[PDB]
Enzyme design. Structure first.
Site, PDB file in Angstrom:
ATOM      1  CE1 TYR C 153      -7.001   5.556  -9.059  1.00  0.00           C
ATOM      2  CE2 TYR C 153      -9.231   6.365  -9.399  1.00  0.00           C
ATOM      3  CZ  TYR C 153      -7.906   6.275  -9.804  1.00  0.00           C
ATOM      4  OH  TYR C 153      -7.474   6.899 -10.955  1.00  0.00           O
ATOM      5  CE  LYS C 160      -0.721  18.187  -3.783  1.00  0.00           C
ATOM      6  NZ  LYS C 160       0.205  17.521  -2.805  1.00  0.00           N
TER       7      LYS C 160
END
Lengths: 224, 242, 246, 264
Positions: C153, C160
């Site tokens: 994951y 970001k």
């Protein structure tokens, strides 16, 4: 050669969890009505135990033999873990989950990331367990705006959850529902919410079924 | 709006299907899928070769009356008259599945250089502009509105076809814009990726190498969703299957 | 429209130096050589001493060091207030988090998820609200993310995406105040099977190699300086074109 | 909790470092028609940074104009070539002659033209094949032919910039087809970047102008009518400043990018 007309979607012997119905006006309620007519077995979660009496009422408009209602506030891990655990015992494995998504302060900001984005991560992490054969997960949305940053975060999360869960044969996708003021004015009309409900329901049926096989990590915009 | 599901198929709908050249053609997965959902289908083709392959492929379909029209999308005349004639023979339609046979793009490619002006304009003509003129003529047969679907599908240095594709994708979004007031949705389907010994062992089992997978039926299913009323609130979108 | 373009008489706060390999240090050397006055932030005493050794390779006639933990509303507000008192108004902020500080609480955990949101994305927001006060005549804020490469994951990948969205909404918010906000997406910097993908990105990326700290510093100089006075809300990939191979 | 101490300066730098210095660089500049041209702003900027500049033109009226604008730059040598990009041989010969005259270059700046045509007056679905393909030829393919010839002058590498200015030319009903030509150009930039990267030739684009975006609508009419004062004047210098970044080593490692230069 062909003596009967085929159905695009048919959800008999399919079980779906539908999360975040509050009232007859919820977008998820229209998803329920649509999946119900496609003959799915439906399970419903709700946040506040103060609104279980309403869901029971709504479930009447539905063709569901036995009612499966669960209190799950997704801000709480234990409720999401336990909640899905019970579902596993009560109705066995499921075929998919529909999840209805609900300068500024740090708390203001991280709370929106919790409520609007991470909620998809924890749902997916627990529901994973009732989907040993694969399944399908849909998330729906309806000085500066942290709301826009929260939504961008979720869109990204759909993407990475998809890559992540892809190996488990589990598809993750999202729906985006909704002089530009003229449009906000329209969306105010009862008729219009009504139209939104059926359209999101129809599109969620596509995504939650085998009709959308090979489709994951996507964000479909449903409008008008 | 009143769903009334269970009765969710394409009975009483009529679509024009472009881009079939043989059994493996992706547009044939679309044709089979729509056929099984009850739709009436009209087929286009440029080459005789493709017309005979169609006559054979109709055997495996459930269309009572066969409807084949020669249309070279590079000719305005043939698009205008082809579609005019479709309206005479079958009346109004509900949608178009737009696609160009994979064979067309590889032969009319080894002809010009990737970098050549002629090469560049020809890719833009067949891959993108074709959709514009097709939508303009099919629009005449969708007076109450309808649905148009365009699909997206060897580079040496410069991938000229990549640019034709991007052009098409934008063409889709602008058609979606221009055609909304006419109640005509326009959408696209693309191949999807984003939007070590065990690998070897997987290959050993298949008795073959593993490569670019696009499943014709998976495309037909999404096409059916996009061409149907299921997708009533969806236009200018690009759906990635893989 | 003048002959000289450089950073003389500009003052920038640089965040994100842990050590000599920090992208932020690359930025610092670039800005320093261009004539800017630099103010440095840090949280740990480790990185305070490290900055003291590293300042000895620059041409700052003065070391300006402020302890500012971005997780603390108090330290960001007071820290920037002191900077204001000590040095006066500034022309910009380089915002990053050292890759070193990202020292691997569960990937799928709520805390894990929100700590990344907190560190990678919100820190920009509060930094911008307090730094704004030192830029009454406008200014430039740059935010850098680094491909720091991963079980199942990609929780940092979400973080970001959040930062990037944040850059754009700040740029929209701070625009009338004449303050520019931009981001840099730094490719992998060589700085053994974990990073044998410096070899993948390399041979696959158009420019057929990896970038380094100084190349990031060059683009940061561009974004912090007046050469980019018409540029806000952008995200520049300093990554040998790898972004384009999608 | 702060620090503010002195470091000795005896071993420091004695001079001012320049962020961009173009003294030994030669650039070809395409797209100057008059004093208002975006490409003339790029010229001013590259000139003031010591670049050696070569200019191409299409029309004679532009040649006269270039001779007049050159007396505002510090170029000891004038070098003007007629190049119509719609012609293969003109592009091939032009860069050939440039090669013979000045030798190798360090990059190209190319103003993207958008041709006005009859199809601009109607709906997008009514666009003629000719109109559509003309938009593609002019606004997108132009960059392909220029890169193809110019790379012959960049054996050690270089930088190519394409600029699209969204101004009054877009205030037409059929801005859609220009939108499609633009989308094609953005992709061309990326695929050229892919193609030429291995040659150390970077390819990037700038987008500027009073219109923010063509994405999918005569909001465009208002953006035009509501231009900021001297909008083209600021853009000229700001585009030039961004071009200097992209055309120089300052932007090394950066390719395939589209930088939006909008002072709003």
């Amino acid at each position: 050669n062909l003596y009967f007309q085929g159905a695009m979607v048919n959800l008999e012997n399919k079980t779906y969890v539908i999360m975040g119905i509050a009232n007859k006006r919820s977008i998820a309620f229209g998803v329920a009505k649509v999946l119900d007519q496609l003959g799915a077995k439906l399970v419903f979660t709700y946040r506040k135990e103060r609104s279980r009496k309403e869901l029971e009422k709504l479930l009447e408009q539905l063709n569901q033999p036995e009612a499966h209602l669960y209190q799950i506030d997704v801000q709480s891990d234990e409720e999401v873990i336990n909640g899905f655990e019970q579902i596993g015992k009560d109705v066995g494995n499921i075929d998919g989950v529909y999840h209805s998504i609900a300068e500024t302060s740090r708390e203001g900001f991280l709370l929106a990331q919790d409520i609007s984005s991470y909620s998809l991560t924890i749902v997916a992490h627990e529901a994973k367990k009732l989907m040993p054969e694969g399944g399908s997960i849909v998330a729906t949305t309806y000085n500066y705006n942290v709301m826009g940053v929260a939504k961008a975060s979720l869109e990204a999360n759909v993407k990475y959850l998809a890559l992540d869960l892809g190996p488990d044969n589990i598809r993750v996708n999202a729906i985006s529902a909704g002089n530009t003021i003229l449009k906000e004015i329209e969306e105010r009309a009862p008729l219009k919410r009504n139209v939104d409900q059926v359209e999101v329901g129809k599109t969620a049926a596509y995504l939650l079924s085998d009709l959308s096989s090979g489709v994951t990590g996507e964000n479909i915009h449903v409008d008008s």
